[PDB]
Write a protein that binds this DNA or RNA. Structure first.
Ligand SMILES: Nc1ncnc2c1ncn2[C@@H]1O[C@H](CSCC[C@H](N)C(=O)O)[C@@H](O)[C@H]1O
Ligand SMILES: [Zn+2]
Ligand SMILES: [Zn+2]
Length: 842
DNA sequence: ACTTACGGAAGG
DNA sequence: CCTTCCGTAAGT
């Protein structure tokens, strides 16, 4: 019996209906509808009432889909031909945003939608008040029908942000004009005038300044290098091989896009027009190419041991239109920098280095020529709710922004792992509801003599509520267990409301944005905007930020009104197109995050080979904890995880002890990519212990699948439900997968083998072959993926201690957030705090 | 403590 | 029509 969630009155008032039993109280044309007081500006007008500037009015739409429109008058000028004009800056009602019907009917939002309009279209004068956060907004934990507005709404990305504090002065007009000037690339600093073109030293695009000698990303189609590029099985032996007709290899990186084409700008020129003057509309850049290691004559096999940010210089140049440039990088000579390249790589984002030049004609490496050489903030005190082993906390710690001073996790192994990993934090082993109810009163000491965090002592509240009820792998979500699992979101929001931290982060599975027609996400956003927070939501792919594993996780961010709402991080590593589906459809509206890198990215994809090609071979049912490395790291991922320190001890290289039948099943699965249970031979086998494996028998005709070529049947039960003795044990082929494969996508990926060039599927708590996520066997060895292999799939450093038995270690590793993803989010928050500090300084 | 049998909505 | 994927009761 889980304990009910304790909530403040504020949070309970919104979640009252959904979790009723789980919480205990604690534009188009318009219709015309008339006197005065180049362009003459006057303060007031008389439409039977004294309309002025700064007060909001209403506009009646012709269509009946929207009841009425609300606008704000910004200026009142007179036009001769048009008539009496005024500039209307529109409002978005609460029932049209992402909040849906959840928002109260008296909530309005600012938007960047404005236009000129005639005075006859005004229907009535409506009072709208700017509700603002109080001076004690940080200390409001736990507490007439006119329209009020408090937040500004970005429709494309579904963002809420505090109103921007900045003669017909319209904020929307200025912002849109800034956008128009942002999109157009503009050129400056004339250098030399030539007969057929003009030379320019610098240029500007989207607020980024490009100069002769910088680095530029280009799309994979921008140019190309000079190097030239590039049976019916027996139905008796494999009765279930006919199910491999989809011809879609799971976890394949073959179709992944290529990374960005890096280059160095050599000159900027414009072609002279027919009038003898430069054309500032088309800008043509000449760029020296940079060979990636997989672009040389040595193909991808050259990108197994090489650094992620390594390139080769070349003397081949190309011409590309300026609009194709997709960013800026710092491609600097490796030995030019006084510091080592290892520190330089982490010195800043978007940094590449080259050390040797490449010649395509002779396919040889030379010394790059002479001209190619080219000669604080205090960390936020953090409370982390529902931590576990502390993936998010570790990511933020290595991002350099946070400092986890408290934790909430009752499960003993996870709590002790958190204790071991963060020696300076106080971890509570209790229920979140009990601790919150205790801290409502000034208890300031729990039963174990630990100090609870007081109001004003928490600055960053981060965590992820249990996602076992939200996930799609959960067939029982209407039971009490799943409901009480879902109800912890309300407890998390209660902590957020009570403490009022500067930043609030809620992580969950992707299905969180679609559970019960996205009712939970909508309710969370409504609570966040009712608190007074600036909240945004999105879906991030874990595999695009450094890990070798597909994991789409929903992130909800919020910041205090004085703060700035962080932008979602930009992808760094390319990933398979079928995996990067980050759009969110809520109430038939499609929201996409501010992420612009949708196709490609700077760095290349991380594969399984880069993850676990250095771990020594281990046998099934391993139990040794401290083993020794048999070799140095053999990739960038392993070199980064292990570190430059001399540690020859490997921990947590253990695999679950599978029985004899499961070992025999995982022994007969071939090593070819895309292999799973479907091609298991149907032959009698002798297990490790002395016991016989029967042959699976098909006694019932399969109507939907028909009969095989040999005439044998395909059904295994009376389902087309189960008679007694229909189940058959001790068979190499499992019985359940043939029994119910027709209505479950033929159980693709069960007993599956990872491929070296592929990627991990979404890691779960228990890596068992027969689970819904079943692609767990090693690419070569006949065993399940070890604990260390799983932790590397999640990007955990090899020096990240885990506590408990093997099942508890697997649960800790599979329940966490990949530290690369948390590091990216922390870097975005670092940018936000740096901007706020810079604004505060001057 | 361990093993197994597997619903159904969303997005292309 | 195919693919996703923080797993859970039920049995043993
Ligand atoms: N029947 C049950 N009733 C209540 N909790 C249970 C339970 N079965 C398992 N649990 C535990 O509930 C945990 C998720 S809720 C526990 C975390 C809690 N909110 C906190 O303050 O830290 C799981 O780790 C699980 O170990
Ligand atoms: Zn305007
Ligand atoms: Zn059956």
């Amino acid at each position: 019996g889980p304990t009910k969630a304790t909530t403040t009155k504020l949070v309970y008032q919104i979640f009252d209906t959904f979790f009723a039993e789980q919480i205990e109280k604690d534009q188009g044309k318009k219709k015309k509808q008339i006197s005065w007081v180049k362009s003459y500006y006057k303060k007031v007008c008389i439409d039977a009432e004294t309309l002025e500037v700064g007060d909001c009015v209403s506009v009646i739409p012709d269509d009946s889909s929207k009841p009425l429109y609300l606008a704000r008058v910004t200026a009142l000028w007179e036009d001769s031909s048009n008539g009496q004009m005024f500039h209307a800056h529109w409002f978005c009602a609460g029932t049209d945003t992402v909040l849906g019907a959840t928002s109260d009917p008296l909530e309005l939002f600012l938007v960047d939608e404005c236009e000129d309009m005639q005075l006859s279209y005004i229907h009535s004068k409506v009072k709208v008040i700017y509700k603002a956060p109080s001076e004690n907004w940080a200390m409001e934990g736990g507490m007439g029908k006119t329209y009020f507005y408090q937040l500004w709404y970005d429709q494309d990305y579904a963002r809420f942000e505090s109103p921007p504090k900045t003669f017909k002065f319209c904020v929307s007009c200025a912002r849109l004009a800034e956008m128009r000037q942002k999109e157009i690339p503009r050129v400056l600093e004339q250098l030399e005038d030539l007969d057929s073109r003009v030379l320019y030293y610098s240029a500007t695009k989207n607020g980024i300044l490009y100069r002769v000698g910088d680095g530029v990303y280009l799309p994979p189609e921008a140019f190309t290098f000079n190097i030239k590029l590039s049976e019916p099985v027996d139905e008796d032996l494999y009765p279930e091989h006919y199910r491999k007709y989809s011809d879609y290899i799971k976890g394949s990186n073959l179709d992944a896009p290529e990374p960005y084409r890096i280059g160095r700008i050599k000159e900027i020129f414009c072609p002279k027009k027919s009038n003898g003057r430069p054309n500032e509309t088309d800008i043509k850049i000449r760029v020296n190419k940079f060979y990636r290691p997989e672009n040389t004559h040595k193909s991808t096999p050259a990108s197994y041991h090489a650094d992620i940010n390594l390139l080769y210089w070349s003397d081949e140049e190309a011409v590309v239109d300026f609009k194709a440039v997709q960013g800026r990088c710092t491609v600097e000579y490796g030995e030019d920098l006084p510091e080592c390249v290892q520190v330089y790589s982490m010195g800043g984002p978007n940094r590449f280095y080259f050390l040797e030049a490449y010649n395509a004609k002779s396919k040889s490496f030379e010394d790059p020529p002479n001209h190619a050489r080219s000669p604080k903030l205090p960390k936020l005190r953090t409370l982390d709710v529902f931590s576990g082993c502390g993936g998010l906390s570790e990511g933020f710690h290595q991002a350099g922004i946070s400092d986890t001073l408290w934790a909430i996790e009752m499960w003993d192994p996870a709590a002790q792992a958190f204790r071991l990993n963060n020696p300076g934090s106080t971890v509570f082993t209790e229920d979140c509801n009990i601790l919150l109810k205790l801290v409502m009163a000034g208890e300031t000491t729990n039963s174990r003599g630990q100090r609870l965090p007081q109001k004003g002592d928490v600055e960053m509240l981060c965590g992820g509520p249990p996602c076992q009820g939200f996930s799609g792998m959960n067939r029982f979500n209407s039971r009490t267990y799943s409901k009480f699992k879902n109800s912890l979101v309300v407890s998390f929001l209660s902590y957020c409301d009570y403490y009022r931290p500067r930043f609030f982060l809620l992580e969950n599975v992707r299905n969180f944005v679609s559970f019960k027609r996205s009712m939970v996400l909508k309710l969370t956003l409504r609570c966040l905007v009712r608190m007074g927070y600036q909240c945004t939501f999105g879906v991030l792919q874990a595999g695009q930020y450094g890990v070798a594993q597909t994991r789409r996780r929903a992130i909800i961010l919020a910041a205090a009104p004085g703060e700035k709402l962080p932008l979602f991080p930009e992808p760094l590593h390319v990933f398979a197109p079928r995996a990067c589906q980050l759009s969110v459809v809520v109430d038939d509206k499609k929201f996409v995050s501010n992420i612009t890198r949708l196709s490609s990215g700077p760095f290349r994809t991380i594969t399984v080979r880069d993850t676990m090609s250095d771990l020594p071979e281990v046998r099934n049912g391993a139990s040794a904890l401290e083993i020794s490395y048999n070799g140095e790291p053999q990739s960038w991922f392993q070199r980064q995880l292990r570190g430059a320190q001399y540690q020859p001890i490997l921990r947590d290289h253990i695999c679950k002890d599978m029985s004899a039948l499961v070992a025999a099943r995982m022994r007969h699965i071939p090593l070819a990519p895309g292999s799973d249970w479907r091609d298991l031979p149907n032959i009698e086998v002798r297990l490790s212990d002395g016991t016989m494996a029967r042959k699976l028998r098909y006694t019932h005709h399969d109507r939907k699948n028909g009969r095989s070529s040999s005439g044998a049947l395909r059904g295994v039960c009376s389902c087309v439900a189960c008679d007694p003795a229909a189940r058959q044990f001790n068979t190499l082929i499992p019985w359940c997968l043939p029994h119910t494969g027709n209505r479950h996508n033929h159980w693709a990926g069960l007993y599956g083998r990872l491929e070296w060039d592929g990627f991990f599927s979404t890691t779960v708590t228990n890596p068992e072959p027969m689970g819904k996520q079943g692609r767990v066997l090693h690419p070569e060895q006949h065993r399940v993926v070890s604990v260390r292999e799983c932790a590397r799939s999640q990007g955990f450093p090899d020096t990240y201690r885990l506590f408990g038995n093997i099942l508890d270690k697997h649960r800790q590793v599979g329940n966490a957030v990949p530290p690369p993803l948390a590091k990216a989010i922390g870097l975005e928050i670092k940018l936000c705090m740096l901007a706020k500090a810079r604004e505060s300084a001057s």
